[PDB]
Amino acid sequence: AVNVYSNLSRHDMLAWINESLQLNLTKIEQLCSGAAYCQFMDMLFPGSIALKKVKFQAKLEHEYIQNFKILQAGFKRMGVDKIIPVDKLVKGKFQDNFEFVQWFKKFFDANYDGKVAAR
């Protein structure tokens, strides 16, 4: 796994995510549930994440955190050293989510090769 450290406009970022995962989000803070990231991760390394455990429709904050722990666990397994700012993301505010989402996109672009229903 290729680790990334330290770009897209907010409109294209949402667009990229929606298209990529066939979703219909309207704001960057909605990524605060950790679910989309679990799918991208499972898409980068099929099997590194147990989708069945991911709560795709999570609405509670501790549920958001649970998803992120599954993500971090997938990271550790694949040698990804990025420390996820979980407590800030799960609060659902725009800057942090946007700061992290830019990171994740670069991380994804660096590791993807490839090959709805999964949720």
Curated annotation (Swiss-Prot):
Compartment(s) where it occurs, according to its Swiss-Prot or TrEMBL record: Cytoplasm, Cytoskeleton; Cytoplasm, Cytoskeleton, Microtubule organizing center, Centrosome; Golgi apparatus; Cytoplasm, Cytoskeleton, Spindle
Residue span(s) of domain Calponin-homology (CH): 7-109
Modified residues (N6-crotonyllysine): K59
Modification after translation, per record: Crotonylated by KAT5 during mitosis, promoting astral microtubule plasticity and dynamic connection between astral microtubules and the cortex during mitotic chromosome segregation, thereby ensuring accurate spindle positioning in mitosis. Decrotonylated by HDAC3.
Quaternary context: Homodimer. Heterodimer with MAPRE3. Interacts with DCTN1, DCTN2, TERF1 and dynein intermediate chain. Interaction with DIAPH1 and DIAPH2. Interacts (via C-terminal residues 206-211) with APC (via C-terminal residues 2674-2843); the interaction inhibits association with and bundling of F-actin. Interacts with CLASP2, DST, KIF2C and STIM1; probably required for their targeting to the growing microtubule plus ends. Interacts with MTUS2; interaction is direct and probably targets MTUS2 to microtubules.
Annotated family: Belongs to the MAPRE family.
Protein name, as recorded: Microtubule-associated protein RP/EB family member 1
Organism: Homo sapiens
Residues of the full protein shown: 2 to 130 of 268
